[PDB]
Each structure stands twice: as C-alpha cells, then as structure tokens.
Amino acid sequence: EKGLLVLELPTPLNSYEEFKVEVRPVQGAALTVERIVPASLPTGGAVSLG
Amino acid sequence: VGIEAAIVLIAFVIVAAALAFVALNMGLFTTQKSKEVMQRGLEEATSALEVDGSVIANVTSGSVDAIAIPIKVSPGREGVDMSVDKTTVRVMLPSKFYENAYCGVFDGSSLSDSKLSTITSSIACTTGWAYLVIFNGDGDNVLELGEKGLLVLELPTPLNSYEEFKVEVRPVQGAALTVERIVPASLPTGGAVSLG
C-alpha cells in the first residue's frame, strides 16, 4: 500500500523558509521530514521540493 | 527462580526496543538530510552565470558614466536567484571601493524602447546604483535559461580615460562572476561606447 500524506496550510510558507513535519504512530519510530522551499516558484501547479 | 529471570528478560527486551526506536528514527532523519545536502551540492555545481557579449558603457561630457554588463546562465539551466536580499554586487574603482551597490531587479518591459539612455533614466533605485534588467522573462526575480539579463551601473563622476575597474557579482548559490575592463583612449562626446 502506498500512502501520500497531505497538509492543507492556510497562508503559511513563502519563499526560502523551512518547515518541519513529524508523524507519531502508536507503534514504531516517529518519522521526521524537513524541507526548504526553493527560490523558483511557478504561478500555479505543483512544485517539487526535492 | 524463574520469575526474576523473566523480569530481567522483560527489562532487557524493553531497553532494546527503545534503542531500536531511537536508532531507526535518527537513521531515517540522517539519511534524509544526506539526500538533501547532496542534492544541494549538485545544485551548487551548476548555475554558473557568465558574461554573454561585450560590455557597453555610456559616456557624457568626455567621461564614462554608466556601464552595462550582459550576462546569461550557463548550460545546465537551474536558474540563479537575483533577489535584492540574496545577491550582492561589488564594484572596485581606482579611487573607490563599494561592497554592496545592488538595488534590485526590474523587469525589462522594453520600456519605450531598448535605448541605453532610456534604461538608465527610467529606472531609478532608492539606495545604490547597480540593478539587473531581465529580457524575455516571465516576471520573476530569478534569472533562468531563455532569459537575457543586462546589469547596469550608474556611476556618479568616476571613470576617466585609461583606468581599470572591477565588477563582481555574488549570488547566494553558484560561482561569483568577475568582470574587469579598461576604458579605451577614444571616447565620443555622446552615445554608447563599446568596451570590448
């Protein structure tokens, strides 16, 4: 099974600032995700964060 | 006899579980950060930025006033950010040294036309002189492939004949660009003069 975890953020996240996302299951290791928004952002559509 | 052995076994298993939890969590985090850092290194490898063409200067009253330096992005795409807060331009003059003369990037809407006088006159900066003008761009402050950039200096009463000047651009990512030219002996009373 493939899972895609989605965040709906109302008016955060301009250019160049970092964010941190952590998942805490009842069993197993917590997952840590940290990414930085790139300088080049299109006017619409998805942008890859690497 | 058995019961205390079972209790010790339970304790030792629980300790091992905590160690495993910590190990997997930190290993996943460090693998992700290694991925990110090597991706950033690959990004830094490209995005060179280079001079495309000849530097062209504006001369008034027998002295060089403004300097236009044409630049483009190197092969590999991966555009260079030209924002005000991320790029610094260094100007080294025979009697002056400026660490940061960058004022920003204004879109090249072609103005009334592509005159050097029109570009130098219509655009003004609140602080500093050097600005970059993008051509054929999409309106962003990032110089990408397919976009032509012309970096302009507004120099108040430097640059007579025969003395050298040095201009350096310092992007946040990628190699710094070094430009050095010498003013020729023959300067017209007006209009642009080529610096080669």
**Is B154:B89 a contact under the CB 8 Å cutoff?**
no
For residue B89, the surrounding DSSP H or E stretch is strand B88-92
- For the record, the structure tokens of A17 come out as 């600032």
* DSSP symbol at B76: T
* Count of CA atoms in the C-beta half-sphere (13 A) of B143: 32
Residue B183, token pair as written in the block? 């003013």
A34 and B39 within 8 Å at the Cβ level: the answer is no
The rounded distance, in Å, linking the Cα atoms of B108 and A41 is 20
d(C-alpha B150, C-alpha B137), whole Å: 12
Evaluate whether B78 touches B173 at the Cβ level (below 8 Å): no
CB atoms within 10 A of CB B108: 19
As a whole number of angstroms, the distance between CA B176 and CA B89 comes to 10
**Whole-number Å distance between alpha carbons of B91 and B167:** 5
How far is Cα of residue B33 from the mean position of the Cα atoms in its chain?
Answer: 25
> What distances in angstroms separate CA B54 from CA B3, B7, B143, B155, B194, one per listed residue?
88, 82, 19, 19, 7
C-alpha neighbours within 13 Å on the C-beta side of residue A40: 16
Distance separating alpha carbons of residues A36 and A49, to the nearest angstrom: 7
Cα B67 to Cα B90, B92, B97, B173, distances in angstroms:
14, 13, 16, 25
- DSSP for residue A30: P
Put simply, the answer to whether B39 touches A33 (Cβ < 8 Å) is no
Tell me if B158 sits within 8 A of B96, measured CB to CB.
yes
Chain B: closest CA distance from residue A35 (Å): 8
E strand or H helix that includes residue B14: helix B2-45
Give the count of Cβ contacts less than 8 A between chain A and B. 30
Task: List CB contacts (< 8 A) between B18 and chain A.
Answer: none
Q: Test B142 with A35 for CB contact under 8 angstroms.
A: no
Q: Count Cβ atoms below 10 Å from residue B62 Cβ, excluding itself.
A: 11
B179: which strand partners?
A: B167
A32 CB neighbours in chain B (<8 A) are 25, 28-29, 32
- Return the sign of the alpha-carbon dihedral for residues B6, B10, B12, B13: positive
Contacts of B114 (CB under 8 A, 6+ apart): none
The terminus-to-terminus CA distance of chain A in angstroms comes to 22
**Exposure on the CB side of residue B141, measured as CA atoms within 13 A:** 16
Q: What is the distance between the terminal CA atoms of chain B, rounded to a whole angstrom?
A: 94
Q: Residues of A with CB below 8 A from B25's CB? A: 29-32
Cα distance from A11 to chain B (closest Cα, Å)?
A: 20
Rounded Cα distance between B160 and B112, Å, is: 30
- Experimental resolution (Å): 3.5
* Cα B35 to Cα A25: distance, rounded to the nearest angstrom: 24
Q: What is the CA radius of gyration of chain B?
A: 27
Q: Is A28 left (phi over 0), alpha (psi -120 to 50) or beta?
A: left
CA dist B102 and B171 (Å) reads 11
What is the Cα–Cα distance from A29 to B32, expressed in whole angstroms?
A: 15
Sign of CA dihedral B106, B111, B116, B120: negative
> Residue B168 — φ and ψ, nearest 5°?
-130, 140
Q: Are B170 and B49 in contact (CB under 8 A)?
A: no
